[PDB]
Amino acid sequence: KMPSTANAKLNEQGEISADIGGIAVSVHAQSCTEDSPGIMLCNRSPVVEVTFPGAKPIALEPEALYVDSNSTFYHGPLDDTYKKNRHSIILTDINGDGHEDVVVWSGKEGNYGGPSYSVYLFDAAQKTLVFNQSLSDITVMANGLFSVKGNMLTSTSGDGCCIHVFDTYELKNNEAVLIERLTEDTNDPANPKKKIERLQDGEMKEVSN
Ligand SMILES: [Ca+2]
Numbered sequence: 001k002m003p004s005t006a007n008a009k010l011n012e013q014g015e016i017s018a019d020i021g022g023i024a025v026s027v028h029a030q031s032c033t034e035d036s037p038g039i040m041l042c043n044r045s046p047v048v049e050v051t052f053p054g055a056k057p058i059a060l061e062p063e064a065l066y067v068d069s070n071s072t073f074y075h076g077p078l079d080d081t082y083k084k085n086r087h088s089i090i091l092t093d094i095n096g097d098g099h100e101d102v103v104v105w106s107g108k109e110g111n112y113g114g115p116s117y118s119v120y121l122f123d124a125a126q127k128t129l130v131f132n133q134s135l136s137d138i139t140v141m142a143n144g145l146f147s148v149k150g151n152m153l154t155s156t157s158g159d160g161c162c163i164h165v166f167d168t169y170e171l172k173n174n175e176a177v178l179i180e181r182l183t184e185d186t187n188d189p190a191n192p193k194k195k196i197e198r199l200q201d202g203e204m205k206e207v208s209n
Pocket of ligand 1: 092093094095096097098099100101121122
């Protein structure tokens with residue numbers, strides 16, 4: 001399960017074409033504008049086409065695409081240990097069924113205007129990649145893309161100072177559900193406050209333990 005990466009920039013036809021760990025990925029995007037060094041914002045019908053081995057190409061049409069020519073593609077797991085990078089297009093099995101899914105840097109609705117993502121799970125029945133609202137939504141106001149551990153997904157939020165929120169989601173059948181929210185408040189370093197909420201009887205409840 002070794003992680004592999006690659007970088008690329010949109011050529012004169014607004015095109016990239018790469019093979020990352022045996023999965024071919026192409027990008028077709030015109031009329032992009034430079035957002036910051038090495039990074040183009042493409043929001044005029046950008047297309048990300050993914051061809052898994054032995055399969056028909058699948059075209060994704062994200063609402064926008066941030067193409068970082070210095071960190072373009074990543075193929076590997078979302079380890080809390082391993083992945084502290086930000087990539088434009090990520091191939092990774094989020095739901096543990098043995099087939100890679102796709103994560104695309106599509107917005108900047110993360111915490112303090114950081115990256116937010118569109119998540120697409122491979123749907124084995126349909127032979128396609130299906131946009132996942134619940135998973136994409138985790139990245140909104142998050143400090144970055146979530147990490148995956150078994151069927152558990154972790155994400156952090158907060159005010160970038162003294163309030164930190166640590167979320168744990170359980171993923172069952174294309175559906176991410178929040179099961180735990182840990183809020184730590186260190187505004188008074190001498191009096192740190194910790195709040196634990198957990199999913200109980202179908203609702204998030206504050207708990208002592
Ligand atoms: Ca999968």
